[model samples]
Target: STIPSEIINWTILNEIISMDDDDSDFSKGLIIQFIDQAQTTFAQMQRQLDGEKNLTELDNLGHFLKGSSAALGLQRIAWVCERIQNLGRKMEHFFPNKTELVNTLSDKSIINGINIDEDDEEIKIKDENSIYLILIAKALNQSRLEFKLARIELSKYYNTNLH
Candidate 1:
């Protein structure tokens, strides 16, 4: 089976090579270190999210991702991280306010037979929140794929250029 072109792009490979001196090893050991750090950081973020740790940690991870993605010129990833940072802040706002709104609206709607607009507003806010999460997921996946490709390209360069 043919591998997908998305699995490897020569343009990125060339860019990796361009970073090195013609005679220097293009297999940049430092790049591998960066990728390792990124992978570890991403995994930690996932764990935090899964564990429902404080939003503060998630925000910090987003901030870290933003810097790392920018340094690597992963513009899509960087933008996503930036968005997550903002969303983390909003998420912190959502829970407490949501509970209060639910209590207040529930009493009014129940006693008065009034259909609360709170439901509509809540749905709209949730929809917007979903968009931010989706963007962050996309960025994480793309950044990981790009990092993998970069590693492969570096390996190829080392094999060809070092020998």
Candidate 2:
């Protein structure tokens, strides 16, 4: 049931397009910059996942990508990035899927609308860290997937070859 709307908010991106230079260079350049930055950030995120396992760093990276994604109207990627940022720092923020996120973190590991319960002592600190690691790992992978999808879609829209 997924559609383009699930991947991006065309209205927002179109607003950016509307402001393009006569030849559309402005919007094209912006998209190229976004793709380059997104790729670089994804690589850095992978490094953190690979061995760093630094939650604070992940939080920062996620925050950075979230802003970039939002700027480009990448809805799904931005949403998951918000999850990574909040969860990495154990921050509490609300989203429509709060219950779902909490329950998933409860059942396995989490993201989006996730409220890390202060009292989930059943899982010890070490175990909880592992859980958080798993959650962030999954989110990172999902973000990569969304980035690829967006790249393909945007490339088509712009009539540019994938490079």
lDDT (tens digit, per residue) of candidate 1 on 54-114: 4567678889976765554444345445655766777422122222322432122222442
lDDT string for model 2 (18-97, tens) is 88757658888887888899889878977777776899999999999889889889876787888888778777333333
RMSD vs true structure, all candidates: 17.4, 9.7
Clashing pairs in 1: none
- Which residue pairs clash in candidate 2? none
Q: Which candidate should be chosen as best, given TM-score against the real structure?
A: 2
What TM-score does prediction 2 earn? 0.71
Candidate 1, superposed: residue stretches over 4 Å from native = 1-19, 91-163
User: Where is model 2 poorest over a 10-residue stretch in terms of lDDT?
Assistant: 116-125
What TM-score goes with each of the models? 0.48, 0.71
